[PDB]
Amino acid sequence: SQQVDKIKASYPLFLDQDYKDMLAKKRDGFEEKYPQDKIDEVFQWTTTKEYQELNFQREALTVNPAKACQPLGAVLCALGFEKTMPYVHGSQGCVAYFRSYFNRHFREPVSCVSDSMTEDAAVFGGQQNMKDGLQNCKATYKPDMIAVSTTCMAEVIGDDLNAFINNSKKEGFIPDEFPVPFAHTPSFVGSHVTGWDNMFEGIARYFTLKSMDDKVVGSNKKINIVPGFETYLGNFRVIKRMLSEMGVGYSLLSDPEEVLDTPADGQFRMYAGGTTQEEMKDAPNALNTVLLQPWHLEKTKKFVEGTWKHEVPKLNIPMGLDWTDEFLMKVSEISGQPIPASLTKERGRLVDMMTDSHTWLHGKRFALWGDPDFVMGLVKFLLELGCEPVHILCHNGNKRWKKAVDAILAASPYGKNATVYIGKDLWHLRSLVFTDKPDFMIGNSYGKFIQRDTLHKGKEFEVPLIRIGFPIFDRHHLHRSTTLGYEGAMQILTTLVNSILERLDEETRGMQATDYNHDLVR
Amino acid sequence: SQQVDKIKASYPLFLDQDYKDMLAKKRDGFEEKYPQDKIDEVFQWTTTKEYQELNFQREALTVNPAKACQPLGAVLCALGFEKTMPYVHGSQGCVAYFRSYFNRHFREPVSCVSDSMTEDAAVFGGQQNMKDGLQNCKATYKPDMIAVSTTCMAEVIGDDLNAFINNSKKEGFIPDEFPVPFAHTPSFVGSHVTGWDNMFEGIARYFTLKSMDDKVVGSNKKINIVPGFETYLGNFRVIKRMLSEMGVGYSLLSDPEEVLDTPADGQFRMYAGGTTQEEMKDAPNALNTVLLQPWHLEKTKKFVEGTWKHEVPKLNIPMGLDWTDEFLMKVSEISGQPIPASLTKERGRLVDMMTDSHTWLHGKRFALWGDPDFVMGLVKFLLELGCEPVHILCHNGNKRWKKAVDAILAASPYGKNATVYIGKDLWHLRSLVFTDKPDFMIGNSYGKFIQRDTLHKGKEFEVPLIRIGFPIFDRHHLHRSTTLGYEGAMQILTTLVNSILERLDEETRGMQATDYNHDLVR
Amino acid sequence: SREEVESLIQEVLEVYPEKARKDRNKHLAVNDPAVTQSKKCIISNKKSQPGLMTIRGCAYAGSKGVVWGPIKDMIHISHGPVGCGQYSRAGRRNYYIGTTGVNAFVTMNFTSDFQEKDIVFGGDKKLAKLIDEVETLFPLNKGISVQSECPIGLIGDDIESVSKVKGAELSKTIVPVRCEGFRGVSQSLGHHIANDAVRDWVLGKRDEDTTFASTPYDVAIIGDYNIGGDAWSSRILLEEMGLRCVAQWSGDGSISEIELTPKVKLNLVHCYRSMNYISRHMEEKYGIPWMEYNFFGPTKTIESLRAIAAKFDESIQKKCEEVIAKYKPEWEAVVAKYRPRLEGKRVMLYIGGLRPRHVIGAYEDLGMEVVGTGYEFAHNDDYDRTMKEMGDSTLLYDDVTGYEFEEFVKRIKPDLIGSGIKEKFIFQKMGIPFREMHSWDYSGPYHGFDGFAIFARDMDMTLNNPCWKKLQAPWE
Numbered sequence A, B: 001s002q003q004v005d006k007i008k009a010s011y012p013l014f015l016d017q018d019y020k021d022m023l024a025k026k027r028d029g030f031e032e033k034y035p036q037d038k039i040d041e042v043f044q045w046t047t048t049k050e051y052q053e054l055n056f057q058r059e060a061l062t063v064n065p066a067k068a069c070q071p072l073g074a075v076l077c078a079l080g081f082e083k084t085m086p087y088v089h090g091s092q093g094c095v096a097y098f099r100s101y102f103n104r105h106f107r108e109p110v111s112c113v114s115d116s117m118t119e120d121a122a123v124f125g126g127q128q129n130m131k132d133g134l135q136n137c138k139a140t141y142k143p144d145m146i147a148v149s150t151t152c153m154a155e156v157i158g159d160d161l162n163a164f165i166n167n168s169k170k171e172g173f174i175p176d177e178f179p180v181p182f183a184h185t186p187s188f189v190g191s192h193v194t195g196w197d198n199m200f201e202g203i204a205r206y207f208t209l210k211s212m213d214d215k216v217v218g219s220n221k222k223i224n225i226v227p228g229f230e231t232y233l234g235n236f237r238v239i240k241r242m243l244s245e246m247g248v249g250y251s252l253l254s255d256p257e258e259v260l261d262t263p264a265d266g267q268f269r270m271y272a273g274g275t276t277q278e279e280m281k282d283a284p285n286a287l288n289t290v291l292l293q294p295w296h297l298e299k300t301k302k303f304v305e306g307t308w309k310h311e312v313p314k315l316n317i318p319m320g321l322d323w324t325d326e327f328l329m330k331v332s333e334i335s336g337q338p339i340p341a342s343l344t345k346e347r348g349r350l351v352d353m354m355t356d357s358h359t360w361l362h363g364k365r366f367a368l369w370g371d372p373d374f375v376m377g378l379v380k381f382l383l384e385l386g387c388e389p390v391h392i393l394c395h396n397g398n399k400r401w402k403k404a405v406d407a408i409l410a411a412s413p414y415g416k417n418a419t420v421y422i423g424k425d426l427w428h429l430r431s432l433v434f435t436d437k438p439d440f441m442i443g444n445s446y447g448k449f450i451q452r453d454t455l456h457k458g459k460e461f462e463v464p465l466i467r468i469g470f471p472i473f474d475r476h477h478l479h480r481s482t483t484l485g486y487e488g489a490m491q492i493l494t495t496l497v498n499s500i501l502e503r504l505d506e507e508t509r510g511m512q513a514t515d516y517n518h519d520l521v522r
Numbered sequence C: 001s002r003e004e005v006e007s008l009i010q011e012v013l014e015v016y017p018e019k020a021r022k023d024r025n026k027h028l029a030v031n032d033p034a035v036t037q038s039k040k041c042i043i044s045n046k047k048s049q050p051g052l053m054t055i056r057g058c059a060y061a062g063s064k065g066v067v068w069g070p071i072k073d074m075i076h077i078s079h080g081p082v083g084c085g086q087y088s089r090a091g092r093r094n095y096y097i098g099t100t101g102v103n104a105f106v107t108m109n110f111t112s113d114f115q116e117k118d119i120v121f122g123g124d125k126k127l128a129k130l131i132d133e134v135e136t137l138f139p140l141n142k143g144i145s146v147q148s149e150c151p152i153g154l155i156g157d158d159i160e161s162v163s164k165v166k167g168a169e170l171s172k173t174i175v176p177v178r179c180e181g182f183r184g185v186s187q188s189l190g191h192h193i194a195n196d197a198v199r200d201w202v203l204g205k206r207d208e209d210t211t212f213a214s215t216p217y218d219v220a221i222i223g224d225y226n227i228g229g230d231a232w233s234s235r236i237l238l239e240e241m242g243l244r245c246v247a248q249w250s251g252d253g254s255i256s257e258i259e260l261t262p263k264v265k266l267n268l269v270h271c272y273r274s275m276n277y278i279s280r281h282m283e284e285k286y287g288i289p290w291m292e293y294n295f296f297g298p299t300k301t302i303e304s305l306r307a308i309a310a311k312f313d314e315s316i317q318k319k320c321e322e323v324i325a326k327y328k329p330e331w332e333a334v335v336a337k338y339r340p341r342l343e344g345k346r347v348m349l350y351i352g353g354l355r356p357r358h359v360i361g362a363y364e365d366l367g368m369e370v371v372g373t374g375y376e377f378a379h380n381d382d383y384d385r386t387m388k389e390m391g392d393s394t395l396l397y398d399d400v401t402g403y404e405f406e407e408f409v410k411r412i413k414p415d416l417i418g419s420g421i422k423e424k425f426i427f428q429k430m431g432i433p434f435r436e437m438h439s440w441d442y443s444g445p446y447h448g449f450d451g452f453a454i455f456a457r458d459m460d461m462t463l464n465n466p467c468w469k470k471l472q473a474p475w476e
Ligand code: ICS
Pocket: C062, C066, C092, C187, C225, C227, C271, C273, C274, C351, C352, C353, C354, C355, C356, C437, C438, C439
């Protein structure tokens, strides 16, 4: 029954008595569901350390991973260029999934196409598929460039993208001067960040490899910036803002700011902003190239150093205080321009905020996960705040990243209880947060279930989640946030301190029981 | 007993068994506590409608007010001028309390002095206190201007500030050219916003009354901006940023953002930024004067229209879409500078966020309180979002403001269940949220107690609080936020939608009971 | 040595041209343990110089915000404009147990909300209607206090008559306190007036009642304000010894405990400055002896426990020994873990009355030398007690100016400074670690063996925080 005055959605319409009796009858009659006590003892067993030992012995089963496949990053990279179309050579289901994922995260239209290869295309190849697809895409959506990635289906069968594109140009399906860069993005190697790196390397190769005879390093007085797989528009904003405050000329390659931030003014824009092709062809003339996330921009670094002849600086991600200072100082050294007083004042404000919040931040324990560069930046920032990272998880990390993060932990005294895990999924993290309880978790929306898990054991075992990373699905407009630079550090500090204070307020809201510590001033 | 490894603060150390036994013995032995069933009965009675009828018959008792006294606002206004020292004529406990309040909000040093009037000054006046205090404050702190407000002791006796300052100048305690403006700020009239208005009018009078012969309106092609009592630094920053984006000359009067966000770099800066005396003297030459909060800048409006002969526009506070649009259009009309593309894109992005979040914001019931202009702006924005403000409370509001807000509510079908209360306090709002339960409250930190009260009746009866306003004591760095303009509306929208989603996630976290609605995507 | 300290004092005073320098030279001094009477070197309890940005409060703060506010079951009315209650509301962590708004009213703000009409024509009838409204809307209240803000004493309102008439009419105790801000020079006079109000209106309602069973182990904690739970820790420590803490006020205090105080066998006064008046009155009238005690630090806690056990029979002494033996390993472990990270550090304090001289024992128990302490409202006896405990060649100040504290710290350069909220950020911007010596920085308790662990942890977390090392930009 529904009352037209107060209509109830699924919650709490399924909490009324009649629905409860219907559910109970169905459960007791037809499910043959296990007895409740069996379920409680199995859950308790899952929370123990014997279950942790069994879980960490996994070799073939992956439960709730924390990574995606390469073509997702390839699409994200292709979306960062002016009037550029992400074309994926393979199956249409992959493009549908990529579009839905990015639509749920950014809450913005995401344009990507496929040749929709079928079983006959699997047997015979996708040459005709790509000819027709390129012609149709150019005719219908009118892009200035088509950036081609691959699905696992095409990567297994050895589809030669180069030969297919050259044949399509030769037979007249696309104009010869129409730029069609490509990259091989096998989904069974690496993760989405690897796909981003491969797509950027392919675009850079296409635009620069054959025209490096009249390029002189430092001719155009600019510094190239390669952001990598970034899902916070505020990061691009803060990087450009800080570079403009210094007066440094720059070329932010792969700038997806505008196409993911189009206004609602009555018209739909498929393309907006983006790195221009003239910026890509002039990239080797820059003073130097700076990679914001070097731990997944490895092939790009190899190409830049070996072809553009740019001595890429060894800088970490500009996150936290110290690494932001190092980034600013290195940019100043490269460009020859001093750091202005505005950035010094901003750093002073960040230090003031740390000084204000150190009492509530000191000693808190965090279990965090995400991408390599972002995770290591969080570890560094938390160490600078006095916090104690206890469980550091990177599903798409390698041994060298493990060594680097171990060195970072060993430098600080707040890393004596820190363990770094590579190749582990979120079920491993669930076992860890049950067996070694941290104060909080830091990750994407997929961690919410872990929190739910903890709340089923008890209110005192609950581990709240703080949503920083990719993808965020159950909160709105968090992709607007900033994590890079002093502004990003301020945002992260505010989020962490307010999360701690909110948890404390929830714990002290009991009248006559725990309200003695319910203080107005904190 | 304390374990050295895990040291417990008051919570949950006083939850230990020995402490519970000791408190139980203390309560049962010598406290003469009322029986707990009687406590439950009285609480349930206080949550009833009859208690609401009794509470709303109050004519002499104020419980948990939502306002302050005039000299606090006067001090905040004085802090906005360059090298200016707020000087309170009266007791020192008032200055101690003002400093404590502003420190607990801004987490910053606040400079204010007093003349320390004692019982002797209650029989012979506070003349010598004026002379000695002005001399000492000039000597040891070296300001460029001492802005004098009053405390109620000084108002009850009836001290003549003009005569006191004139005599102090004549004798030789301060140089005759030293700027010492003054204003009468009785604490029994109005609230802190009235004090801000009085202080601004006094400063403007002192700097402009006897120099109006040579002033020409519009001779300097600038627009005066009077922000009023403002405790969000983002509001000052956003006003300056949008006025600079249009390329219009502006002279923001009483800008305290620099002294309230001083960088921490090893030194203490007691003075920083602020409106220059030259600006205040040149103000009558401006094109016009725009008041951001006209509902507590009445005497400033009267002085500006009467003396500066500026046709002050009839503008509401630039909060939300429509009012920010009116502010920008009126500024464009006054200055002749068109609105650029960046502002249009930002407005479109705000509209896009509204389209994204409308399905969650629709029909939500809010009880909000604060200052008149801020409350009316929030009500307007909530009406634009499809929300339903039900309990609108303004302790310092008047009949005319209530009529204006009622007219605003009549213009939308979402104000049908809206009632505006003036002259009421937080006990009234507690009764209202117990009897007419809203989905959320929007207010300052003092509302947290109300939330606790609601949680005592039950989890289903809890009304979560959203911290927007002044003062916010239990959270860190919320004073850096923005409420005005498109950016402020974006931040408010994100706060509201995230509060709704966090509450929904909390309500559906129970396993096998409400977890069917614990959706990953929302 | 003393020469440089005196040179710094003179250099700081040089800014004040003629009269402020003369006034301020008296309140600045150099410690000498051989001096008994501090009046020969320092002068306190004097009016503040105008325009010097003092840190003292008012008598209303010392009465409503210190002595009367922590009483949970009583309703306190801030008679006057809205400002003082608003600013004094829940800003002080006098912890208590009770249901707020029903049988507890510590964090609530009750005011008459004076307007111009009330100022001109008076507010006695407004106060009468106030009291009837309070009684009808808060029936479980066990008494009403009326704290007078400035205008009320200025406009000559007579609230004693209305208080007596209402007390007769509704048969409920109503305590009028004339704690106007203009009275006195600091919060100390607020303590005196609040103590006199307790004496004349509350302390003697069971002078003819003998229904209370009394044991030879009856003690009353006086002046413990439960700031974060210090009183609870002290009370558990004293009850483990076998003593019955019959009364505990103001912190976590009920009117019944104050009423039953005249029946105890000893008065353990924590804050001498705020309750010495009532301590001496109870010694004179009821014949109850009182002593000062110090639970701030394991050494001082042990000494205080032994001193208290000295004036009871052998059972109490042996229970004190057993309590000491029980709690010894815990504070030994605290010292072992936190002494190496704090040995040799230098501290300067400027808090208030009792605390600046009483924190010294635990500050030294962790090995941190203290080089300067000061008060804002303490009297000469407080300084006399300070001289013995404080080390030689240390700077003492009274009624410190923000300028004076600034230029004293710029010269001494200590590793840690403990003061109030009004200096927290000022000293934070200077790179000096700071601790809110009242708010305990929204932490605590710091009293007793249990509080010593929290004190050591907080000292470590502020003194060795990384943020203090990053104030200077690498390029600057
Ligand atoms: S009462 Fe006094 S200022 Fe003795 S007015 Fe003040 S809760 Fe201080 S040094 Mo706040 S004489 Fe108590 C005090 Fe000491 S409020 Fe507390 S910490 S021991």
